[PDB]
Structure formats: C-alpha cells, structure tokens
Amino acid sequence: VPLSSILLQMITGYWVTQSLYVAAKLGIADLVADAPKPIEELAAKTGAKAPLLKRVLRTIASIGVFTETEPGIFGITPLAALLRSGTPDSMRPQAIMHGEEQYRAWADVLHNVQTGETAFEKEFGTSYFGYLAKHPEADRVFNEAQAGYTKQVAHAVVDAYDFSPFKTVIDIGAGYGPLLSAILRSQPEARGILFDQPHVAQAAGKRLAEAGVGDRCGTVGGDFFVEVPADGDVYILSLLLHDWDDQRSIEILRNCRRAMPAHGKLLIVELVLPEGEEPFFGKWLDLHMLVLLGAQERTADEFKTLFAASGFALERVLPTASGLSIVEARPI
Amino acid sequence: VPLSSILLQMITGYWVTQSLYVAAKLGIADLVADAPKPIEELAAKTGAKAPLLKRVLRTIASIGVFTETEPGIFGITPLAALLRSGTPDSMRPQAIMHGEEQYRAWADVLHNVQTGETAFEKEFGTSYFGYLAKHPEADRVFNEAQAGYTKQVAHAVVDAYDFSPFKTVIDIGAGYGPLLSAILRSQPEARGILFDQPHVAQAAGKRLAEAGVGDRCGTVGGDFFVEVPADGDVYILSLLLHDWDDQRSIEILRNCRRAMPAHGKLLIVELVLPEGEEPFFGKWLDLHMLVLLGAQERTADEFKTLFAASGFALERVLPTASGLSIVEARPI
Ligand SMILES: Nc1ncnc2c1ncn2[C@@H]1O[C@H](CSCC[C@H](N)C(=O)O)[C@@H](O)[C@H]1O
Ligand SMILES: Nc1ncnc2c1ncn2[C@@H]1O[C@H](CSCC[C@H](N)C(=O)O)[C@@H](O)[C@H]1O
Numbered sequence: 001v002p003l004s005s006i007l008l009q010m011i012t013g014y015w016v017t018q019s020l021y022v023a024a025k026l027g028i029a030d031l032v033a034d035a036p037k038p039i040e041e042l043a044a045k046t047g048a049k050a051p052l053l054k055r056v057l058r059t060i061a062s063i064g065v066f067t068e069t070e071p072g073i074f075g076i077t078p079l080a081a082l083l084r085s086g087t088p089d090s091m092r093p094q095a096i097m098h099g100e101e102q103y104r105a106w107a108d109v110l111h112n113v114q115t116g117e118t119a120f121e122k123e124f125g126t127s128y129f130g131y132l133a134k135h136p137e138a139d140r141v142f143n144e145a146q147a148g149y150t151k152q153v154a155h156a157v158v159d160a161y162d163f164s165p166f167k168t169v170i171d172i173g174a175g176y177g178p179l180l181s182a183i184l185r186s187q188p189e190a191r192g193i194l195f196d197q198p199h200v201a202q203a204a205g206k207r208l209a210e211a212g213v214g215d216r217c218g219t220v221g222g223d224f225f226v227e228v229p230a231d232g233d234v235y236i237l238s239l240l241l242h243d244w245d246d247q248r249s250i251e252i253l254r255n256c257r258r259a260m261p262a263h264g265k266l267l268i269v270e271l272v273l274p275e276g277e278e279p280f281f282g283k284w285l286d287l288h289m290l291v292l293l294g295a296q297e298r299t300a301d302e303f304k305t306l307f308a309a310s311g312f313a314l315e316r317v318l319p320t321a322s323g324l325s326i327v328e329a330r331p332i
Numbered sequence: 333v334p335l336s337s338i339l340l341q342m343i344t345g346y347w348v349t350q351s352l353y354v355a356a357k358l359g360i361a362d363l364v365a366d367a368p369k370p371i372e373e374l375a376a377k378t379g380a381k382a383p384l385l386k387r388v389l390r391t392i393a394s395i396g397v398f399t400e401t402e403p404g405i406f407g408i409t410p411l412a413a414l415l416r417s418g419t420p421d422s423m424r425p426q427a428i429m430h431g432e433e434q435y436r437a438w439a440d441v442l443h444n445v446q447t448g449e450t451a452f453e454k455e456f457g458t459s460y461f462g463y464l465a466k467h468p469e470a471d472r473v474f475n476e477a478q479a480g481y482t483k484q485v486a487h488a489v490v491d492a493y494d495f496s497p498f499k500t501v502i503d504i505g506a507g508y509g510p511l512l513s514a515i516l517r518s519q520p521e522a523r524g525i526l527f528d529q530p531h532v533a534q535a536a537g538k539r540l541a542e543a544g545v546g547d548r549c550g551t552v553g554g555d556f557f558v559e560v561p562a563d564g565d566v567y568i569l570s571l572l573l574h575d576w577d578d579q580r581s582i583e584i585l586r587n588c589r590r591a592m593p594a595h596g597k598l599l600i601v602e603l604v605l606p607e608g609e610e611p612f613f614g615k616w617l618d619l620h621m622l623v624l625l626g627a628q629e630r631t632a633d634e635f636k637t638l639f640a641a642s643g644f645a646l647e648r649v650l651p652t653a654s655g656l657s658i659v660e661a662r663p664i
C-alpha cells in the first residue's frame with residue numbers, strides 16, 4: 001500500500017464521519033436490529049431517497065458497518081450495533097454529535113491556530129456551553145454522548161482507586177453522572193452529590209430515578225465559577241478541567257478548595273498527556289478542546305502548576321486500564 | 333482494541349482531515365523539507381500561534397506526519413514529504429482541497445440523501461464548476477489535486493490499452509492532462525488535443541510543456557455541452573462522466589458522437605463499480621460525487637444505457653492495475 005494511499009485515507013477522514021452520521025441520524029441500526037431489511041423499507045421508514053441511502057450503506061458496509069446480506073438487503077454488524085438507540089453501550093449520540101455543530105466548528109480550526117480565536121465561538125457567536133443551554137436537542141445529544149464515553153471507562157476508574165474512605169462523594173460538573181453512579185454502586189455506604197448547571201442537574205436526577213439508582217444520590221444545580229457544595233469527603237472533577245483554560249480552571253479549583261473540608265481529597269479524572277510521540281487519544285481530544293472551548297488536555301506538570309495556584313498539592317497520578325489517569329491532590 | 337474504540341476513531345475522521353489541512357495550508361512541510369525547525373521559527377514564518385501549532389504538529393506526528401526531533405523542534409517524515417509544494421508526487425493540493433469548500437459541502441450530505449438536493453449547491457448557491465470558475469485560488473487547487481490523483485494511476489491505464497493505432501488522441505475535459513501526457517509519452521508519433529474550459533485549457537499548456545509533450549499537444553478551450561473538437565481517432569473521457577447526471581452525460585456523449593469519425597473509438601476511464609462488498613475507493617468517491625455534483629459512479633450496465641441514448645455500443649470493459657477500468661465503445 002503506497003504512502004500516497006495511506007495519506008489519502010487520512011485526508012478523507014471527514015467522509016467517514018459524515019457517512020456514519022447519516023446512518024446514525026436516520027436510525028438504520030434500530031430498524032435492522034431484529035433481521036436484515038430491504039432498502040426500500042429502510043428508506044421509507046427514515047425519509048430518505050432509496051438509491052442514495054443504498055449508496056451510503058454500501059459504502060460503510062465496505063468498512064464493516066452494516067452488511068449487504070443479499071443484493072439490496074441490509075443487516076446489522078458488530079460496529080453498527082453500537083449505533084442502536086437507547087442500549088446500554090450506545091454510541092449513537094456520539095456519531096450524531098460529531099456530524100453537527102462540532103463538525104462545522106472544526107471547519108475553522110486553521111483560523112483558530114492562526115488567531116487564537118476559538119473556532120466554535122467564531123462560527124456560532126458564543127461559548128460552547130452557552131450555545132447548548134439555548135438548544136435543548138443539541139444539549140441532550142451532548143450530555144448523552146459525554147455520558148456514553150464516560151460510562152464505558154468508569155469501571156476502570158473504580159478498579160484503580162480505593163473509594164472506601166469517602167462517605168460523601170461530590171462530583172463537580174457531573175453531567176448525567178455515569179462515573180458517580182459507578183462509584184456509588186461499588187460503595188454501598190457512600191452518598192453522592194451530582195453537581196451541574198441547573199438544567200443538566202434536573203435532567204440527570206430524572207435519569208437516575210428512571211434507572212432506579214438515585215437512592216443515595218442527590219442533585220444540585222449551580223455554577224462552579226461561584227460556589228460548589230460544601231463538606232464533601234472527595235471532590236471529583238471528571239473530564240472537566242480540559243474544558244477550561246488555565247485562568248478558568250484555577251477559578252474552579254479555588255472554589256473547590258474553599259468548599260472542601262481539610263480531610264477532603266481532590267480527584268481529577270482525565271486523559272493526562274504522556275511524554276513522547278506514541279499514539280494517544282488524548283492528543284486528539286486536546287485539539288477538539290481547542291476548537292470547541294479554547295482549552296486543552298494537560299500533562300502532570302501542568303496540573304502541578306494549577307494546584308500551586310489553587311491551594312492543592314499533587315499526591316500521585318494513578319494509571320487506569322483505560323487512557324485515563326486519576327490525579328489525586330490534597331488541600332494545603 | 334475494543335470495538336467502541338474502532339468506531340470512535342471512524343466517527344472522528346474529520347479531526348484528521350482538518351489537522352492535516354492546517355499543516356498543509358500553512359506549508360510546514362516546505363519549511364522543514366531540508367532540516368528540522370523549532371516551533372518558534374515555524375510560528376513566525378506561518379503567522380500561527382506557536383503553542384497551538386505545536387499541539388497540532390505533535391498530534392499529527394503521533395500518526396507519522398512530521399516528527400518531534402527534540403522538544404519543540406519538528407522535522408519531516410515520508411508522509412509529511414507528500415505535503416511539500418511543487419514536488420512530483422505532491423498531495424498538498426489534495427489536503428488543501430479536502431479541508432475547504434468540499435469539507436463544508438459534506439456537512440449537508442444528510443440533507444442530500446433525504447431530499448436529493450446537491451449539498452454543494454445548498455451550501456454555496458451555485459454549481460461546483462460554476463463556483464470554481466469564479467474563485468481562482470480554489471480552481472488552481474482543484475485542478476492540481478485532480479491532476480495529482482490521475483498522475484498516480486495513468487501508467488495503469490496506458491499499460492492496459494494499446495494506444496499505438498491512434499494518430500490523434502482527443503481528451504475531453506482533460507484538466508491539466510496527466511493521462512493525455514502519459515499516452516503521448518508512450519506514443520512519440522501521436523498528436524494530442526487537450527479540451528477543457530478556456531481557463532483550464534489555458535493553464536494546461538504549461539503542464540504539458542513540463543510533461544514533455546507540449547510540442548505535440550494542442551489545448552482547446554470550450555464547453556463540451558455545446559461542441560467538442562472533430563476528427564479524433566480516439567476520444568478519452570477520464571474521471572469525467574462521474575461528474576454528471578444521466579441527462580448531462582448523454583449531452584456530452586452525443587457531442588462526442590457527432591464529432592467522431594466512423595473508425596473512432598470512445599474510451600471512458602472511470603472507477604466502475606463492482607458488485608461485492610470489498611473495499612473500493614470508488615464507493616467513497618461515488619458519495620463525493622453526490623455531495624459536490626449530484627452525480628455518481630456507474631456500473632457497466634449503466635454505461636450501456638447512456639451509450640444507447642448517444643449512438644454508441646459497448647465493446648469491452650478492460651481492468652487495470654488501479655481501481656480504474658477502461659470502458660471501450662464504438663460509434664453506431
Ligand atoms: N458554570 C458551570 N457550572 C456547573 N457545571 C458546568 C458549568 N459549565 C459547564 N458545566 C458542566 O460541565 C460538564 C462538562 S462534561 C463532563 C461531564 C462528566 N463529568 C464526565 O465525566 O463525562 C457538563 O455537564 C456541563 O454542563
Ligand atoms: N462545460 C465544460 N466544458 C469543458 N470542460 C468542463 C466543463 N465542465 C467541467 N469541465 C471540466 O471537466 C474536468 C473534470 S475533472 C477530470 C479531469 C481529468 N480528465 C482527469 O482524468 O483527472 C475539469 O477539468 C473541468 O474543468
């Protein structure tokens with residue numbers, strides 16, 4: 001395989017994103033979950049032009065997403081099973097999210113690199129979370145995508161740290177709270193507080209009650225730039241600080257330090273950037289955080305610098321059976 | 333390597349397109365072609381913010397495109413060498429092309445599949461070639477990208493067909509003419525006519541001179557929906573009909589039919605679609621043709637239909653060592 005074909009496949013990655021977006025957004029996987037279906041039925045049920053849908057499905061089937069079981073009849077595959085709606089490991093929200101506003105923001109990453117102006121803010125006229133707070137459907141998609149990402153790695157975080165000492169667990173910017181839920185499931189003596197923006201914390205609470213897992217979890221709606229809940233034994237910032245530049249991260253951390261009792265601990269759960277040139281998903285997420293939020297992933301030394309500015313000291317960086325690390329800090 | 337990670341890497345293909353686009357557009361490969369350079373110097377020369385450019389470069393370095401030779405110093409790799417400007421195998425124009433209007437048009441592929449409305453025309457308010465004729469920088473990029481792709485497959489076409497019987501070879505919509513040039517190189521006694529829009533035919537002369545065939549190859553500007561040049565021994569349509577719907581393709585073919593002499597041959601060089609589920613670049617290019625042009629790749633049976641409507645009969649479909657096939661037809 002010539003180098004030119006390797007590079008061409010890289011350059012054309014956007015085709016894959018959008019072709020999978022089409023299949024995800026139309027909900028094809030749900031329609032073929034029981035048995036393969038003819039193209040005309042799939043088109044009719046999804047509101048697509050049959051010959052055009054056929055072309056999209058043939059193309060992604062060639063990389064293992066759906067399969068043409070007989071001419072004009074399409075079935076599910078292992079990769080397409082992840083695009084079903086409402087299943088425990090669904091990645092449908094992720095496929096949807098990456099084909100919409102985030103795709104468009106990324107059209108201007110060059111301008112962002114040249115000027116420092118956050119690409120999403122240029123494209124849509126306000127901050128990422130400010131935008132989502134105005135658009136409930138996009139908000140739902142983001143929160144479900146984010147929760148699906150974290151749900152899949154939560155077990156690895158729980159296997160990597162002893163949570164026994166903590167009876168009150170405060171998750172700051174918890175989203176829909178899959179990691180908090182996993183911690184509570186594993187520690188039957190613990191109670192949790194799921195802290196987020198009011199609209200997110202309200203929806204998270206209903207999701208917990210629905211799933212019947214909110215007995216020892218309460219929700220609090222607030223603003224971590226103003227204050228966070230007091231008296232927790234551990235404060236968890238999971239996939240949170242990489243949303244914020246240094247100035248804003250320091251603000252969050254100082255509010256955590258204010259609220260925390262002196263016996264409390266701080267846990268940062270994130271894709272800590274390694275040394276060297278090996279492949280790492282966090283190197284790519286780092287650029288996504290640039291485009292959307294004007295933020296970044298960080299090295300251990302960068303966290304140390306944030307901690308010194310916020311009244312914390314790094315205790316240790318614990319690895320996990322995922323890309324994530326736990327950065328443990330103590331109040332000083 | 334969990335399935336969920338495989339699918340996430342597919343969904344995030346757009347990040348790769350855009351990150352390579354930044355490095356290509358800024359011209360980093362030319363800056364480091366002869367020796368590695370520190371990020372400060374790269375930032376200064378390109379008008380980029382150093383910390384942000386460093387992040388992009390270290391991310392693409394982790395997939396083999398550039399290398400961090402020491403901290404904050406970057407050098408070339410074989411994949412990044414393909415992003416240099418003006419080199420014989422340059423893919424710089426392809427990387428630029430795919431990150432700009434074509435990327436933005438692909439944001440609307442769902443709507444195109446739902447409604448049949450061409451995504452590029454929705455996004456830009458005009459046809460693809462109409463846009464390019466008014467945007468010189470994008471036009472040069474397109475034409476150089478297209479010629480670079482075709483150059484890498486031209487030997488496979490010439491190897492698959494004996495061009496020795498033809499005294500005059502006419503290439504309809506030839507662009508900058510790399511296939512025509514390969515044909516003429518292979519047959520020193522042959523004369524060529526390159527036909528394209530006036531602005532393209534005008535620019536092609538310089539490329540034909542560089543290719544060493546300029547002394548034997550005329551450049552004719554015009555519109556193939558009106559007329560094409562008469563009396564050629566063979567008329568070549570290479571990566572041409574896939575730009576046009578059936579009706580417009582028939583218009584082109586009928587003009588070729590009335591220009592052609594009775595002993596003439598028609599050769600269509602295209603990514604003819606196969607029936608199975610194997611990987612095939614033409615499956616992806618077929619979607620690209622939808623998005624940009626409201627067009628398609630075709631099967632042999634589809635070409636027979638067009639030929640019946642335009643006074644031609646299929647003679648043979650010849651395979652090549654590339655994805656391309658040669659559809660040979662005769663006037664009836
Ligand atoms: N000012 C603010 N106050 C509280 N929460 C905020 C906030 N600004 C953003 N957030 C929340 O920060 C979260 C970032 S996403 C991280 C979600 C989750 N902790 C996980 O591990 O996946 C979102 O749920 C968002 O609503
Ligand atoms: N109406 C028209 N008349 C003449 N050429 C046209 C045209 N509309 C589009 N084209 C040309 O059709 C070409 C399509 S791209 C194919 C280029 C080349 N044959 C190759 O093998 O790569 C472009 O060069 C474009 O300028």
Ligand code: NA
Binds near residue numbers: 054056059615616618
């Ligand atoms: Na296709």
Ligand code: NA
Binds near residue numbers: 107432433435
């Ligand atoms: Na762009």
